[PDB]
Amino acid sequence: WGYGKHNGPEHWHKDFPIAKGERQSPVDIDTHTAKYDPSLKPLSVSYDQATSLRILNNGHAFNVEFDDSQDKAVLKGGPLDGTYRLIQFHFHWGSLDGQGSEHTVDKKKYAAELHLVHWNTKYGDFGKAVQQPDGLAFLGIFLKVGSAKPGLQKVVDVLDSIKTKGKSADFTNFDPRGLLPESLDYWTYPGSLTTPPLLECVTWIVLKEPISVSSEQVLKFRKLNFNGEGEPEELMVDNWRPAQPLKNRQIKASF
Ligand SMILES: [Hg+2]
Ligand SMILES: [Zn+2]
């Protein structure tokens, strides 16, 4: 599986039949059909204690890994019941500035999309979490090209070191708080992972307000390789999956 013509998203159903399921992500967020829900509580992001460990290029993106052996960085409140631990964050970007995001807003696509992955601490590990309907909680942040994001520079600078698939680098004392928008207004609906295995174990929390990043910050993303070292270079671009059918599901707004 990849994002190429021959192993692309249109082919995932073959190896992963859930690709055609009832609660697949991403989806188009129709802001006029979204249901404002008052009973929705405010999001609770406690990342003060976050412990970043390393960064790795897994051939389809780069992951910043956190120590989830304890409740250091958690997510609670909103639509969620119980606490979710941060395990990793990664992005989805485009070849050009007019594409890259997975989720769209009134059909509008952003340059990138940030996903902070959390697992329900009542299931004990990530492994078991992927076996439950309420196992995961994904925090989605849209990215747009504008002014630089100071808090992303650290990441941007480490990329040189993990250019090819399989590479990794120590990446400690990285604070995710610096990737958060001003507002915490959000859309929420029941979805899935946007990459194989595409498990329908996720509660999606997409923030309304996007973070802005400089063109030169996005450029460094586009310098990455899908390929391993010593193989023909295939730039890591367009690593996003097209919007899926909502299929009777209802998208709710906290605003
Ligand atoms: Hg599941
Ligand atoms: Zn993702």
Side-chain angles (χ1 to χ4, degrees):
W1 74 265
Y3 305 87
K5 192 79 203 177
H6 296 105
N7 60 356
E10 62 270 23
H11 292 265
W12 306 340
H13 80 99
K14 288 168 305 178
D15 273 296
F16 317 91
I18 196 162
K20 293 197 170 165
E22 300 311 281
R23 60 168 288 193
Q24 291 285 292
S25 322
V27 308
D28 178 53
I29 294 163
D30 179 355
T31 67
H32 300 287
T33 273
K35 225 293 193 171
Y36 163 75
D37 173 16
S39 65
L40 221 48
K41 315 142 206 165
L43 274 179
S44 187
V45 190
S46 328
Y47 296 156
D48 51 292
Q49 220 68 246
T51 309
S52 64
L53 286 168
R54 59 106 97 140
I55 175 159
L56 148 150
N57 174 337
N58 61 12
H60 47 271
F62 70 81
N63 291 193
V64 175
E65 299 154 349
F66 296 81
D67 166 13
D68 72 341
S69 67
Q70 292 181 98
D71 289 8
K72 272 223 152 203
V74 300
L75 214 217
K76 28 181 152 41
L80 312 173
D81 294 302
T83 314
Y84 291 68
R85 285 187 199 157
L86 172 64
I87 178 172
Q88 62 98 338
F89 74 78
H90 55 268
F91 309 76
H92 302 271
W93 58 92
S95 46
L96 291 294
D97 298 341
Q99 62 181 40
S101 72
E102 300 214 298
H103 287 92
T104 53
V105 191
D106 293 328
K107 298 304 214 275
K108 168 193 165 40
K109 306 145 173 32
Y110 289 86
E113 183 159 330
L114 174 50
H115 299 145
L116 291 106
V117 174
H118 313 81
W119 50 280
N120 195 341
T121 70
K122 81 195 94 136
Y123 305 114
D125 66 68
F126 181 82
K128 291 286 190 176
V130 299
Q131 293 171 204
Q132 317 298 139
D134 68 348
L136 307 178
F138 273 67
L139 217 214
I141 306 185
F142 301 115
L143 277 74
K144 58 162 176 195
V145 172
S147 313
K149 183 73 164 187
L152 189 74
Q153 196 64 42
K154 271 160 81 160
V155 173
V156 155
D157 289 332
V158 82
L159 297 190
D160 267 328
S161 289
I162 61 140
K163 179 167 188 75
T164 56
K165 173 176 167 57
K167 304 279 183 167
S168 69
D170 291 348
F171 195 75
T172 59
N173 316 100
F174 171 81
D175 189 345
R177 291 172 304 165
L179 309 173
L180 287 174
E182 171 179 325
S183 184
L184 293 187
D185 290 341
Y186 65 87
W187 298 279
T188 193
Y189 80 96
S192 67
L193 308 171
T194 66
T195 76
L198 302 163
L199 304 169
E200 301 184 314
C201 297
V202 192
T203 285
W204 279 94
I205 311 180
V206 183
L207 280 356
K208 183 186 73 169
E209 182 197 337
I211 63 159
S212 80
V213 304
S214 74
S215 170
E216 29 284 284
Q217 284 192 315
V218 155
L219 277 187
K220 295 165 198 189
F221 279 30
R222 292 174 198 145
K223 285 188 146 166
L224 255 28
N225 293 171
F226 284 125
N227 63 280
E229 181 175 29
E231 313 172 351
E233 175 161 24
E234 206 61 61
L235 298 177
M236 186 179 302
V237 298
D238 290 323
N239 57 346
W240 50 269
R241 184 187 191 189
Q244 303 306 304
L246 192 49
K247 303 208 187 174
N248 90 203
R249 292 175 287 176
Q250 187 183 52
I251 309 186
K252 294 192 165 187
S254 73
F255 60 93

Coordinates of all heavy atoms in Angstrom, one line a residue, residues 6-75:
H6 N -0.4 2.6 -8.7 CA -0.6 1.1 -8.6 C -0.9 0.5 -7.2 O -1.3 -0.6 -7.1 CB 0.6 0.4 -9.2 CG 0.6 0.7 -10.7 ND1 1.5 1.6 -11.2 CD2 -0.3 0.3 -11.7 CE1 1.2 1.7 -12.5 NE2 0.2 0.9 -12.8
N7 N -0.6 1.3 -6.1 CA -0.8 0.8 -4.7 C -1.6 1.8 -3.9 O -1.6 1.7 -2.7 CB 0.6 0.4 -4.2 CG 1.5 1.5 -4.1 OD1 1.3 2.6 -4.5 ND2 2.7 1.3 -3.5
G8 N -2.1 2.8 -4.6 CA -2.8 3.9 -4.0 C -4.1 3.5 -3.2 O -4.5 2.4 -3.2
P9 N -4.7 4.6 -2.7 CA -5.9 4.5 -1.9 C -7.1 3.7 -2.6 O -7.8 3.0 -1.9 CB -6.3 5.9 -1.5 CG -5.1 6.7 -1.7 CD -4.2 6.0 -2.7
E10 N -7.1 3.8 -3.9 CA -8.2 3.2 -4.7 C -8.0 1.6 -4.6 O -9.1 0.9 -4.9 CB -8.3 3.6 -6.1 CG -7.1 3.5 -7.0 CD -6.0 4.5 -7.2 OE1 -5.8 5.3 -6.2 OE2 -5.4 4.5 -8.3
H11 N -6.9 1.1 -4.3 CA -6.5 -0.3 -4.2 C -6.5 -0.8 -2.8 O -6.3 -2.1 -2.7 CB -5.1 -0.4 -4.7 CG -4.9 -0.2 -6.2 ND1 -5.0 -1.3 -7.1 CD2 -4.6 0.9 -6.9 CE1 -4.8 -0.8 -8.3 NE2 -4.6 0.6 -8.2
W12 N -6.6 0.0 -1.8 CA -6.6 -0.5 -0.4 C -7.6 -1.5 0.0 O -7.4 -2.4 0.8 CB -6.5 0.5 0.7 CG -5.4 1.5 0.5 CD1 -4.2 1.3 -0.2 CD2 -5.2 2.8 1.2 NE1 -3.4 2.4 -0.1 CE2 -3.9 3.3 0.8 CE3 -6.0 3.4 2.1 CZ2 -3.5 4.5 1.3 CZ3 -5.6 4.6 2.6 CH2 -4.4 5.2 2.2
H13 N -8.8 -1.4 -0.7 CA -9.9 -2.4 -0.4 C -9.5 -3.8 -0.6 O -10.1 -4.7 0.0 CB -11.1 -1.9 -1.2 CG -11.1 -2.3 -2.6 ND1 -11.8 -3.4 -3.1 CD2 -10.5 -1.7 -3.6 CE1 -11.6 -3.3 -4.4 NE2 -10.8 -2.4 -4.8
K14 N -8.6 -4.1 -1.6 CA -8.2 -5.4 -1.9 C -7.6 -6.1 -0.7 O -8.0 -7.3 -0.4 CB -7.3 -5.4 -3.2 CG -8.1 -5.1 -4.5 CD -7.3 -4.9 -5.7 CE -6.3 -3.8 -5.6 NZ -5.5 -3.6 -6.9
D15 N -6.6 -5.5 -0.1 CA -5.9 -6.0 1.1 C -6.7 -5.7 2.4 O -6.6 -6.5 3.3 CB -4.5 -5.6 1.1 CG -3.6 -6.6 0.3 OD1 -3.5 -7.8 0.6 OD2 -3.0 -6.2 -0.7
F16 N -7.3 -4.6 2.3 CA -8.1 -4.1 3.5 C -9.5 -3.7 3.1 O -9.9 -2.6 2.9 CB -7.4 -2.9 4.1 CG -5.9 -3.1 4.3 CD1 -5.0 -2.7 3.2 CD2 -5.4 -3.7 5.4 CE1 -3.6 -2.9 3.4 CE2 -4.0 -4.0 5.5 CZ -3.2 -3.5 4.5
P17 N -10.4 -4.7 3.1 CA -11.9 -4.6 2.8 C -12.6 -3.7 3.6 O -13.8 -3.3 3.2 CB -12.3 -6.0 2.7 CG -11.3 -7.0 3.1 CD -10.0 -6.2 3.4
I18 N -12.1 -3.2 4.8 CA -12.8 -2.3 5.7 C -12.8 -0.9 5.1 O -13.4 0.0 5.5 CB -12.4 -2.4 7.1 CG1 -13.4 -1.7 8.0 CG2 -11.0 -1.7 7.3 CD1 -13.4 -2.0 9.4
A19 N -11.9 -0.8 4.0 CA -11.7 0.4 3.3 C -13.1 0.9 2.8 O -13.2 2.1 2.5 CB -10.8 0.2 2.1
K20 N -13.9 0.0 2.7 CA -15.3 0.2 2.1 C -16.4 0.2 3.2 O -17.6 0.1 2.8 CB -15.7 -0.7 1.0 CG -14.9 -0.6 -0.3 CD -15.7 -1.3 -1.4 CE -15.1 -1.1 -2.7 NZ -15.7 -2.1 -3.7
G21 N -16.0 0.3 4.5 CA -16.9 0.2 5.6 C -17.8 1.4 5.8 O -17.9 2.3 5.0
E22 N -18.6 1.3 6.9 CA -19.6 2.3 7.3 C -19.1 3.5 8.1 O -19.9 4.4 8.0 CB -20.6 1.5 8.2 CG -21.4 0.4 7.5 CD -22.0 0.7 6.2 OE1 -23.1 1.4 6.1 OE2 -21.4 0.3 5.1
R23 N -17.9 3.4 8.6 CA -17.4 4.6 9.4 C -15.9 4.9 9.1 O -15.1 4.9 10.0 CB -17.7 4.6 10.9 CG -17.2 3.4 11.7 CD -17.3 3.5 13.1 NE -16.4 4.4 13.8 CZ -16.2 4.3 15.1 NH1 -16.7 3.4 15.9 NH2 -15.3 5.1 15.7
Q24 N -15.6 5.1 7.9 CA -14.3 5.5 7.3 C -14.1 7.0 7.2 O -15.0 7.8 7.1 CB -14.2 4.8 6.0 CG -14.1 3.3 6.1 CD -12.7 2.8 6.6 OE1 -11.8 3.0 5.8 NE2 -12.6 2.3 7.7
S25 N -12.8 7.4 7.4 CA -12.3 8.7 7.4 C -11.2 8.8 6.3 O -10.6 7.7 6.0 CB -11.8 9.2 8.8 OG -12.6 8.7 9.8
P26 N -11.0 10.0 5.8 CA -11.6 11.2 6.1 C -12.9 11.4 5.5 O -13.4 10.6 4.7 CB -10.6 12.3 5.7 CG -10.0 11.6 4.4 CD -9.9 10.1 4.7
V27 N -13.5 12.6 5.7 CA -14.8 12.9 5.2 C -14.8 14.5 5.0 O -13.9 15.2 5.4 CB -16.0 12.5 6.1 CG1 -15.9 11.0 6.5 CG2 -16.2 13.3 7.4
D28 N -15.8 14.9 4.2 CA -16.0 16.3 3.9 C -16.8 16.8 5.1 O -17.8 16.2 5.5 CB -16.6 16.6 2.6 CG -16.8 18.1 2.5 OD1 -15.8 18.8 2.6 OD2 -17.9 18.6 2.1
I29 N -16.4 18.0 5.7 CA -17.2 18.6 6.8 C -18.0 19.7 6.2 O -17.4 20.7 5.7 CB -16.3 19.1 7.9 CG1 -15.6 17.8 8.6 CG2 -17.2 19.8 8.9 CD1 -14.4 18.1 9.5
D30 N -19.2 19.4 6.1 CA -20.3 20.4 5.5 C -20.7 21.1 6.7 O -21.4 20.6 7.6 CB -21.4 19.6 4.8 CG -22.5 20.5 4.2 OD1 -22.4 21.7 4.5 OD2 -23.4 20.1 3.5
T31 N -20.2 22.4 6.8 CA -20.5 23.2 8.0 C -21.9 23.6 8.1 O -22.3 24.0 9.2 CB -19.5 24.5 7.9 OG1 -19.9 25.2 6.7 CG2 -18.1 24.0 7.8
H32 N -22.8 23.5 7.1 CA -24.2 23.9 7.1 C -25.1 22.7 7.5 O -26.2 22.9 7.9 CB -24.6 24.4 5.8 CG -23.9 25.7 5.4 ND1 -24.1 26.9 6.1 CD2 -22.9 25.8 4.5 CE1 -23.3 27.7 5.6 NE2 -22.6 27.2 4.6
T33 N -24.5 21.5 7.5 CA -25.2 20.2 7.9 C -24.7 19.8 9.2 O -25.4 18.9 9.8 CB -25.0 19.2 6.7 OG1 -26.1 19.7 5.8 CG2 -25.2 17.8 7.1
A34 N -23.6 20.3 9.7 CA -23.1 19.9 11.0 C -24.1 20.4 12.1 O -24.7 21.5 12.0 CB -21.7 20.5 11.2
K35 N -24.3 19.5 13.1 CA -25.2 19.8 14.1 C -24.5 20.4 15.4 O -23.6 19.8 15.9 CB -25.8 18.4 14.5 CG -27.4 18.5 14.7 CD -27.9 19.3 15.8 CE -29.4 18.9 16.0 NZ -30.0 19.4 17.2
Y36 N -25.0 21.6 15.7 CA -24.5 22.3 16.9 C -25.1 21.5 18.1 O -26.3 21.2 18.1 CB -24.9 23.7 17.0 CG -24.7 24.3 18.4 CD1 -23.4 24.5 18.9 CD2 -25.8 24.4 19.3 CE1 -23.2 25.0 20.2 CE2 -25.6 24.9 20.7 CZ -24.3 25.1 21.1 OH -24.0 25.6 22.3
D37 N -24.2 21.1 18.9 CA -24.6 20.2 20.1 C -24.1 20.9 21.4 O -23.0 21.0 21.6 CB -24.3 18.8 20.0 CG -24.5 18.0 21.2 OD1 -25.2 18.4 22.1 OD2 -24.1 16.8 21.4
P38 N -25.0 21.5 22.1 CA -24.8 22.2 23.4 C -24.3 21.3 24.5 O -23.5 21.8 25.4 CB -26.1 22.9 23.7 CG -27.2 22.3 22.8 CD -26.5 21.4 21.8
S39 N -24.7 20.0 24.5 CA -24.3 19.1 25.5 C -22.9 18.7 25.4 O -22.3 17.9 26.2 CB -25.2 17.8 25.4 OG -25.0 17.1 24.2
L40 N -22.2 19.2 24.3 CA -20.8 19.0 24.1 C -19.9 19.8 25.0 O -20.1 21.0 25.0 CB -20.6 19.3 22.6 CG -19.7 18.4 21.7 CD1 -20.1 17.0 21.8 CD2 -19.9 18.9 20.2
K41 N -19.1 19.2 25.7 CA -18.1 19.8 26.7 C -16.9 20.2 26.0 O -16.5 19.7 24.9 CB -17.8 18.8 27.9 CG -19.2 18.2 28.3 CD -18.9 16.7 28.7 CE -20.2 15.9 28.6 NZ -19.8 14.4 28.6
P42 N -16.3 21.2 26.6 CA -15.0 21.7 26.1 C -13.8 20.7 26.1 O -13.7 19.9 27.1 CB -14.7 23.0 26.9 CG -16.0 23.2 27.8 CD -16.6 21.9 27.9
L43 N -12.9 20.8 25.2 CA -11.8 20.0 25.1 C -10.8 20.3 26.2 O -10.6 21.4 26.6 CB -11.1 20.2 23.7 CG -11.5 19.3 22.5 CD1 -10.6 19.7 21.4 CD2 -11.4 17.9 22.8
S44 N -10.2 19.2 26.7 CA -9.2 19.3 27.7 C -7.9 18.6 27.2 O -7.7 17.4 27.1 CB -9.6 18.5 29.0 OG -8.7 18.8 30.0
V45 N -7.0 19.5 26.9 CA -5.6 19.1 26.4 C -4.6 19.4 27.5 O -4.3 20.6 27.7 CB -5.3 19.9 25.1 CG1 -4.1 19.4 24.4 CG2 -6.6 19.8 24.2
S46 N -4.0 18.4 28.1 CA -3.0 18.6 29.2 C -1.7 18.0 28.6 O -1.4 16.8 28.9 CB -3.4 17.9 30.4 OG -4.8 18.0 30.6
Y47 N -0.9 18.8 27.9 CA 0.4 18.3 27.4 C 1.6 19.0 28.1 O 2.7 18.8 27.5 CB 0.5 18.6 25.9 CG -0.4 18.0 24.9 CD1 -0.7 18.5 23.6 CD2 -1.0 16.8 25.2 CE1 -1.5 17.9 22.7 CE2 -1.8 16.1 24.3 CZ -2.1 16.7 23.1 OH -2.9 16.1 22.2
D48 N 1.4 19.6 29.2 CA 2.5 20.2 29.9 C 3.6 19.3 30.2 O 4.8 19.7 30.2 CB 2.0 21.0 31.2 CG 1.1 20.1 32.1 OD1 0.0 19.8 31.6 OD2 1.5 19.8 33.2
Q49 N 3.3 18.1 30.6 CA 4.2 17.0 30.9 C 4.7 16.1 29.8 O 5.3 15.0 30.1 CB 3.5 16.1 32.0 CG 4.5 15.6 33.0 CD 4.8 16.9 33.9 OE1 6.0 17.3 33.9 NE2 3.8 17.4 34.5
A50 N 4.4 16.4 28.6 CA 4.7 15.6 27.4 C 6.2 15.3 27.3 O 7.1 16.1 27.5 CB 4.3 16.3 26.1
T51 N 6.5 14.0 26.9 CA 7.8 13.5 26.8 C 8.1 12.9 25.3 O 7.7 11.8 25.1 CB 8.1 12.4 27.9 OG1 7.8 13.0 29.1 CG2 9.6 12.0 27.9
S52 N 8.6 13.7 24.5 CA 9.0 13.3 23.1 C 10.2 12.5 23.2 O 11.2 12.8 23.9 CB 9.1 14.4 22.1 OG 10.1 15.3 22.4
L53 N 10.3 11.4 22.5 CA 11.3 10.4 22.4 C 12.1 10.4 21.2 O 13.4 10.4 21.2 CB 10.7 9.0 22.6 CG 10.2 8.7 24.1 CD1 9.4 7.5 24.1 CD2 11.4 8.7 25.0
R54 N 11.4 10.2 20.0 CA 12.1 10.2 18.7 C 11.2 10.4 17.6 O 10.0 10.4 17.6 CB 12.9 8.8 18.6 CG 12.0 7.6 18.7 CD 11.7 6.9 17.5 NE 12.6 5.8 17.2 CZ 12.2 4.6 16.7 NH1 10.9 4.4 16.4 NH2 13.0 3.7 16.4
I55 N 11.9 10.6 16.5 CA 11.2 10.9 15.1 C 11.7 9.8 14.2 O 12.9 9.4 14.1 CB 11.4 12.3 14.7 CG1 10.9 12.6 13.4 CG2 12.9 12.6 14.8 CD1 10.7 14.1 13.1
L56 N 10.7 9.3 13.5 CA 11.0 8.2 12.4 C 10.1 8.3 11.2 O 8.9 8.6 11.2 CB 10.6 6.9 13.3 CG 10.0 5.8 12.6 CD1 10.4 4.5 13.4 CD2 8.5 5.9 12.6
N57 N 10.8 8.0 10.1 CA 10.3 7.9 8.8 C 9.9 6.5 8.5 O 10.8 5.6 8.5 CB 11.2 8.5 7.7 CG 10.7 8.3 6.3 OD1 9.9 7.4 6.0 ND2 11.2 9.1 5.4
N58 N 8.6 6.2 8.5 CA 8.1 4.8 8.3 C 7.8 4.5 6.8 O 7.1 3.4 6.6 CB 6.9 4.6 9.2 CG 5.7 5.5 9.0 OD1 5.6 6.2 7.9 ND2 4.8 5.6 9.9
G59 N 8.2 5.3 5.9 CA 7.9 5.1 4.5 C 6.6 5.7 4.0 O 6.4 5.7 2.8
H60 N 5.7 6.2 4.9 CA 4.5 6.9 4.4 C 4.3 8.2 5.1 O 3.4 9.0 4.7 CB 3.2 6.0 4.6 CG 3.1 5.4 6.0 ND1 3.6 4.1 6.2 CD2 2.4 5.8 7.1 CE1 3.2 3.8 7.4 NE2 2.5 4.8 8.0
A61 N 5.2 8.5 6.0 CA 5.2 9.7 6.8 C 6.3 9.7 7.8 O 7.1 8.7 7.8 CB 3.9 10.0 7.5
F62 N 6.3 10.6 8.7 CA 7.3 10.7 9.8 C 6.4 10.9 11.1 O 5.4 11.6 11.1 CB 8.3 11.8 9.6 CG 7.9 13.2 9.7 CD1 7.7 13.9 11.0 CD2 7.6 14.0 8.5 CE1 7.3 15.2 11.0 CE2 7.2 15.3 8.6 CZ 7.1 15.9 9.8
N63 N 6.8 10.2 12.1 CA 6.1 10.1 13.4 C 7.1 10.6 14.5 O 8.2 10.2 14.5 CB 5.7 8.7 13.7 CG 4.5 8.2 12.9 OD1 4.0 7.1 13.3 ND2 4.2 8.8 11.9
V64 N 6.5 11.4 15.3 CA 7.1 11.9 16.5 C 6.5 11.0 17.6 O 5.3 11.0 17.7 CB 7.0 13.4 16.7 CG1 7.6 13.9 18.0 CG2 7.5 14.3 15.5
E65 N 7.3 10.3 18.3 CA 6.8 9.4 19.3 C 7.0 9.9 20.7 O 8.0 10.6 21.0 CB 7.5 8.0 19.2 CG 7.2 7.3 17.9 CD 8.3 6.3 17.5 OE1 9.3 6.3 18.2 OE2 8.0 5.5 16.5
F66 N 6.0 9.6 21.5 CA 5.9 10.1 22.9 C 5.9 8.8 23.9 O 5.3 7.8 23.5 CB 4.7 11.0 23.2 CG 4.8 12.2 22.4 CD1 4.4 12.3 21.1 CD2 5.1 13.4 23.0 CE1 4.5 13.5 20.3 CE2 5.1 14.7 22.4 CZ 4.9 14.7 21.0
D67 N 6.3 9.1 25.1 CA 6.3 8.1 26.1 C 4.9 8.0 26.7 O 4.5 9.0 27.3 CB 7.3 8.4 27.2 CG 7.1 7.6 28.4 OD1 6.4 6.6 28.5 OD2 7.8 8.0 29.4
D68 N 4.2 6.9 26.4 CA 2.8 6.7 26.9 C 2.8 5.6 27.9 O 1.7 4.9 28.0 CB 1.8 6.5 25.7 CG 1.9 5.2 25.0 OD1 3.0 4.5 25.2 OD2 1.0 4.8 24.4
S69 N 3.8 5.5 28.7 CA 3.9 4.5 29.8 C 3.2 5.1 31.1 O 3.0 4.4 32.1 CB 5.3 4.1 30.1 OG 6.1 5.2 30.6
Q70 N 2.8 6.4 31.0 CA 2.1 7.1 32.0 C 1.3 8.3 31.4 O 1.4 8.5 30.2 CB 3.1 7.8 33.0 CG 3.8 6.7 33.9 CD 4.7 7.4 34.9 OE1 4.4 7.5 36.1 NE2 5.9 7.7 34.4
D71 N 0.5 8.8 32.3 CA -0.5 10.0 31.9 C 0.3 11.3 31.8 O -0.2 12.2 32.6 CB -1.7 10.0 32.7 CG -2.6 8.8 32.5 OD1 -2.3 7.9 31.7 OD2 -3.7 8.9 33.0
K72 N 1.2 11.4 31.0 CA 2.0 12.7 30.9 C 1.2 13.6 30.0 O 0.8 14.7 30.6 CB 3.4 12.5 30.5 CG 4.3 12.2 31.7 CD 5.6 13.0 31.6 CE 6.3 13.3 33.0 NZ 7.2 14.5 32.9
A73 N 1.0 13.3 28.8 CA 0.2 14.2 27.9 C -1.1 13.5 27.6 O -1.1 12.3 27.1 CB 1.0 14.4 26.6
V74 N -2.2 14.1 28.1 CA -3.5 13.4 27.9 C -4.5 14.4 27.2 O -4.3 15.6 27.1 CB -4.0 12.8 29.2 CG1 -3.1 11.8 29.8 CG2 -4.4 13.9 30.3
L75 N -5.6 13.8 26.8 CA -6.8 14.4 26.1 C -8.0 13.8 26.7 O -8.1 12.6 26.9 CB -6.8 14.0 24.7 CG -7.2 14.9 23.5 CD1 -7.9 13.9 22.5 CD2 -8.2 15.9 23.8

